[PDB]
Amino acid sequence: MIVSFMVAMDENRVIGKDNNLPWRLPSELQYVKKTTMGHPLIMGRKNYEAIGRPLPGRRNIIVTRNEGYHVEGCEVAHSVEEVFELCKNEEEIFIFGGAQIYDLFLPYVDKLYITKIHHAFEGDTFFPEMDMTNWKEVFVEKGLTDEKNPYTYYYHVYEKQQLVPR
Ligand SMILES: COc1cc(Cc2cnc(N)nc2N)cc(/C=C/C(=O)N2N=Cc3ccccc3[C@@H]2CC(C)C)c1OC
Ligand SMILES: [Ca+2]
Numbered sequence: 297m298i299v300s301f302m303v304a305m306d307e308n309r310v311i312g313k314d315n316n317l318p319w320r321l322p323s324e325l326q327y328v329k330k331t332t333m334g335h336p337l338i339m340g341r342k343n344y345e346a347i348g349r350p351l352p353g354r355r356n357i358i359v360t361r362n363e364g365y366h367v368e369g370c371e372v373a374h375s376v377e378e379v380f381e382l383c384k385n386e387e388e389i390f391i392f393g394g395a396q397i398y399d400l401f402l403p404y405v406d407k408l409y410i411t412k413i414h415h416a417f418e419g420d421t422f423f424p425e426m427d428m429t430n431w432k433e434v435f436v437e438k439g440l441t442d443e444k445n446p447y448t449y450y451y452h453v454y455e456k457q458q459l460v461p462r
């Protein structure tokens with residue numbers, strides 16, 4: 297099971313402001329949709345409620361400590377262990393955020409899909425710092441910038457840096 301982080305962040309790692317994206321980049325979200333198709337999205341409750349609805353065509357799995365939290369059209373998991381059990385047959389899952397949710401799956405992540413937006417927004421939540429010498433870029437692509445996607449941004453994909461033995 298490939299554990300993947302899916303993230304869009306600005307130049308200071310901002311990923312949210314008041315439970316919202318500080319930017320409106322529809323093309324970016326279309327990238328996310330294409331990338332995650334046929335794979336579970338794992339997200340915290342707050343992240344889910346910020347989106348406000350289930351993202352169709354995907355296993356939506358909400359992670360919360362709250363045992364009786366349910367929304368229709370979604371699955372609820374209360375721990376990392378519960379997520380792995382739910383996704384036991386999944387080839388790849390996408391950790392969709394909640395800064396806190398990223399921290400939960402940090403010891404397990406195998407792959408990083410990071411969208412980097414070349415702008416500094418006002419923000420109150422951040423993608424956790426990561427040692428990137430552990431990682432290695434396998435793919436990069438400049439995002440579509442235009443009337444509907446004002447900012448400059450780049451899609452990056454990283455896999456684990458393989459150590460060469462002494
Ligand atoms: C704070 O609010 C949001 C946060 C995120 C997280 C996120 C964002 N970007 C990256 N790179 N990593 C991420 N982890 C995502 C969304 C928005 C999500 C969303 O509508 N979709 N994404 C999944 C998805 C899956 C199936 C169908 C539609 C969607 C739509 C896109 C359509 C309209 C192309 C969002 O609401 C606007
Ligand atoms: Ca792993």
Ligand SMILES: [Cl-]
Pocket residue numbers: 339340341342343344393394395397
């Ligand atoms: Cl969250």
